[PDB]
Design a protein around this ligand. Sequence first.
Ligand SMILES: [Mg+2]
Ligand SMILES: [Mg+2]
Ligand SMILES: [Mg+2]
Ligand SMILES: [Mg+2]
Ligand SMILES: [Mg+2]
Ligand SMILES: [Mg+2]
Ligand SMILES: [Mg+2]
Ligand SMILES: [Mg+2]
Ligand SMILES: [Mg+2]
Ligand SMILES: [Mg+2]
Ligand SMILES: [Mg+2]
Ligand SMILES: [Mg+2]
Ligand SMILES: [Mg+2]
Ligand SMILES: [Mg+2]
Ligand SMILES: [Mg+2]
Ligand SMILES: [Mg+2]
Ligand SMILES: [Mg+2]
Ligand SMILES: [Mg+2]
Ligand SMILES: [Mg+2]
Ligand SMILES: [Mg+2]
Ligand SMILES: [Mg+2]
Ligand SMILES: [Mg+2]
Ligand SMILES: [Mg+2]
Ligand SMILES: [Mg+2]
Ligand SMILES: [Mg+2]
Ligand SMILES: [Mg+2]
Ligand SMILES: [Mg+2]
Ligand SMILES: [Mg+2]
Ligand SMILES: [Mg+2]
Ligand SMILES: [Mg+2]
Ligand SMILES: [Mg+2]
Ligand SMILES: [Mg+2]
Ligand SMILES: [Mg+2]
Ligand SMILES: [Mg+2]
Ligand SMILES: [Mg+2]
Ligand SMILES: [Mg+2]
Ligand SMILES: [Mg+2]
Ligand SMILES: [Mg+2]
Ligand SMILES: [Mg+2]
Ligand SMILES: [Mg+2]
Ligand SMILES: [Mg+2]
Ligand SMILES: [Zn+2]
Lengths: 116, 142, 101, 53, 110, 47
Amino acid sequence: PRVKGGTVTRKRRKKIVKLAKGYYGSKHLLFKVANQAVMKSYQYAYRDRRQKKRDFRRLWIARINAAARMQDLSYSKLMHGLKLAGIDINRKMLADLAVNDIASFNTLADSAKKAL
Amino acid sequence: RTTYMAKPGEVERKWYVIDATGVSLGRLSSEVASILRGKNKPQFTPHIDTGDFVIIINAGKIGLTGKKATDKIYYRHSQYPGGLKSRTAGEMRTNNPEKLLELSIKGMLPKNSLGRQLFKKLHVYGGSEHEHAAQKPEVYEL
Amino acid sequence: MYAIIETGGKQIKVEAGQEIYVEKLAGEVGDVVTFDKVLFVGGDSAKVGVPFVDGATVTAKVEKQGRAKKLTVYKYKPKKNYHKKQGHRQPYTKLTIDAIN
Amino acid sequence: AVPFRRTSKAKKRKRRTHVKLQLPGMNECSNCGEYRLSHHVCPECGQYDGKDV
Amino acid sequence: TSAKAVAKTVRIAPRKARIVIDLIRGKQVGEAIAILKYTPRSASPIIEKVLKSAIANAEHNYDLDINNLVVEEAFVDEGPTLKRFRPRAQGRASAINKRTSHITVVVSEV
Amino acid sequence: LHELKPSEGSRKERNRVGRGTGSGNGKTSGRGHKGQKARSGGGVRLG
RNA sequence: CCGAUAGUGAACCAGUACCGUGAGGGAAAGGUGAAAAGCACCCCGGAAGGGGAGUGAAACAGUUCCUGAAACCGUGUGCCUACAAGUAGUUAGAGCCCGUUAAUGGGUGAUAGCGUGCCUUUUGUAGAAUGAACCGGCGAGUUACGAUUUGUUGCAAGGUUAA
RNA sequence: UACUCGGGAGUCAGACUGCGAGUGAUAAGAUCCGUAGUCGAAAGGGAAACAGCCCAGACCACCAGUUAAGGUCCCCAAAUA
RNA sequence: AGGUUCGUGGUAGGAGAGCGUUCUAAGGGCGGUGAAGUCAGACCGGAAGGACUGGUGGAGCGCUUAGAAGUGAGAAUGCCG
Ligand SMILES: [Mg+2]
Ligand SMILES: [Mg+2]
Ligand SMILES: [Mg+2]
Ligand SMILES: [Mg+2]
Ligand SMILES: [Mg+2]
Ligand SMILES: [Mg+2]
Ligand SMILES: [Mg+2]
Ligand SMILES: [Mg+2]
Ligand SMILES: [Mg+2]
Ligand SMILES: [Mg+2]
Ligand SMILES: [Mg+2]
Ligand SMILES: [Mg+2]
Ligand SMILES: [Mg+2]
Ligand SMILES: [Mg+2]
Ligand SMILES: [Mg+2]
Ligand SMILES: [Mg+2]
Ligand SMILES: [Mg+2]
Ligand SMILES: [Mg+2]
Ligand SMILES: [Mg+2]
Ligand SMILES: [Mg+2]
Ligand SMILES: [Mg+2]
Ligand SMILES: [Mg+2]
Ligand SMILES: [Mg+2]
Ligand SMILES: [Mg+2]
Ligand SMILES: [Mg+2]
Ligand SMILES: [Mg+2]
Ligand SMILES: [Mg+2]
Ligand SMILES: [Mg+2]
Ligand SMILES: [Mg+2]
Ligand SMILES: [Mg+2]
Ligand SMILES: [Mg+2]
Ligand SMILES: [Mg+2]
Ligand SMILES: [Mg+2]
Ligand SMILES: [Mg+2]
Ligand SMILES: [Mg+2]
Ligand SMILES: [Mg+2]
Ligand SMILES: [Mg+2]
Ligand SMILES: [Mg+2]
Ligand SMILES: [Mg+2]
Ligand SMILES: [Mg+2]
Ligand SMILES: [Mg+2]
Ligand SMILES: [Zn+2]
């Protein structure tokens, strides 16, 4: 028997074109450039799921540095002192504590300073 | 998840006066750029302006070491055939200290819209008086 | 009064009555979960653990066991005829905080 | 001599910003109350300057 | 509340009719008729007849006040195209599009 | 007749080449690149 | 076995229209409704074309008339945009506007980080090497008869029929 | 792991870097061998950018930690040690 | 069925398991109280893919187990519109 190619091509291509909503001009209208744009977006998302974590760690470190300089310290000295004292609070918690509850940050800075 | 991000106009910005007598151009420039960016506060957010305003006085007495007064050169091109112009650092210090400080500070700020915004918070004077007494600036020591 | 606790290979700051999403734990909906790896208790008196505060616990109640919103992972290499597609659905546990002891 | 790239819709719409046309300089006739061009004879009554033409 | 009129498959290119239809939109009907009368384009008579037809059937079918109407919306749409040819040099022929248009005008009060 | 099942391992599914690269037999269909043996009707005698 | 780009070149006044001095080459083009009941009459207009009224289950079935995708052309509007250097996204993220197959929801996005299309052919291509204006349909390892190897089933020193 | 027997292949244009030679001028991102590596067919980090150099091999997710080469005045994370 | 250990970059290429399309046979169904097709959605599966709800449409179509193929297009200065 004969199989004519109806109703599957349109379904697949329409799914791809809808995945490209919001792109500029032809990139949200035409299948051939939408397909390329969708592939590029997937690749970019894959790489940025790796870059996001290291960007957030950079931000936390810079904030902790600024908070510790007001207590007559550096980030490097403070981290070494907190290691020497057996304190295992990570960058996320320390930066959160610096912005929001600076008194506990100063407490931990005193503890590190005594450890040195 | 849950990390702090500052909003525009949220963090209160201060006014500072810095005396430029006898300090090397690059050392003062590094410190002032760090202040303008806002990296001395724990509320630093990379996409928001959280820094302060800086006034510099006595810019005619900035220091240059070595033979930088006669041997360091600043260049301009007008984009016309052969239109390159040259100017030494010492005679700018004599004639346009504000341009010298502005060029040095600008070279070490980020190159985007936000950096051009931050450049506008710097005021430089070659003498010892400024025009911003209504802003009540505060003395800041390097 | 709040605490910093260690769970799921990371650390979280916790208050009473707060809803929390963490990596999947063992427990049916409605059971009580106890965290004993408490690093810091704050509020009017700071207890700093080295690395843990002694005898301190936090108790919570299980609200749901779920899988997060679907994600598509796609890779390709140009001019090498190489593509790969995959789906991901990360499981989680939702809890509410009963008490900080 | 020949277009290197095809023109997008936005670029064509930007170029067509000034290809509109203006609005006629007309006002009402003091005699018959109809619309007419300034400095022109009224086509509905044949008047100009308050006289028959 | 509203009345409309359409002219279908009018032998005039849609761009040349749109350029005139643009400056009638949202105007009082008497002012719009005056505007169409004094614009020296070839699309003005066609649009004038469509607009007067809309005013007339508003008055007749819906008993509306013919002295308080405004042009609610006016637009031009593409119709079918006549395909022609033009003999060029070297023995070749080039395509010609004789385009047509549908013209729609709507009137209402206030 | 609504539950026919042939003995297992007696029937296998045919392989089709040139049907996309996710199957492993896509573009060149298992032939390699640019030779006498890559052509239609190509190849040499038995010996 | 095909189902209107298929099946005859030809489902329709087809070896016709058209091209060529000639021998010769050689198309496109199916579908109102169960029934013409195929819109009396009024209104604008020279007409074409409309708006009512009427027929019908349906007129958004009105004599290229079942359905009616995409390219492409328009009208309206929620968010953004006139100091900015952009393979046009992605990650972070205010502000504004909504309210779903109800779930760590939807639209748009000031600003910040990162980021040189797809294919072919190559030692090596973002390549200033090749191909594609865009959208749609069509378009490439098959069948017959032999050989060999693997799997399965029947019988087994036997097994098996051809015409 | 090795070997033996059987079914199915693709490959026969290679490149650079270090070391040992020829040719060349003790030239060449030259040419031709031997030996090891990487690319080819390998993303990630560092050399500003930069197949072949240095570090190191991506099953998926996380707003967790420690290190390598390279770095710690500002652009730009970390010592104006 | 459960453990323990070691693994899971990849071109040419080898091996395996599947998705979807048209038709046939049997079983069992849906459908004018609205089939296929078409449009739109914030749903489900590891992928190819599969449902549910509403609009349009106006008469046919799924599911299960097997069988057979004119069997899946983004590129051919491809053919036709
Ligand atoms: Mg869209
Ligand atoms: Mg957008
Ligand atoms: Mg990472
Ligand atoms: Mg310089
Ligand atoms: Mg490519
Ligand atoms: Mg079979
Ligand atoms: Mg198979
Ligand atoms: Mg058809
Ligand atoms: Mg009929
Ligand atoms: Mg009929
Ligand atoms: Mg008349
Ligand atoms: Mg008529
Ligand atoms: Mg319809
Ligand atoms: Mg119909
Ligand atoms: Mg339509
Ligand atoms: Mg359409
Ligand atoms: Mg708008
Ligand atoms: Mg400027
Ligand atoms: Mg938002
Ligand atoms: Mg704004
Ligand atoms: Mg070549
Ligand atoms: Mg195309
Ligand atoms: Mg080759
Ligand atoms: Mg290569
Ligand atoms: Mg690299
Ligand atoms: Mg020192
Ligand atoms: Mg299988
Ligand atoms: Mg399908
Ligand atoms: Mg049946
Ligand atoms: Mg559909
Ligand atoms: Mg659809
Ligand atoms: Mg849809
Ligand atoms: Mg209907
Ligand atoms: Mg078979
Ligand atoms: Mg078939
Ligand atoms: Mg076919
Ligand atoms: Mg394809
Ligand atoms: Mg061809
Ligand atoms: Mg073509
Ligand atoms: Mg056609
Ligand atoms: Mg064509
Ligand atoms: Zn008059």
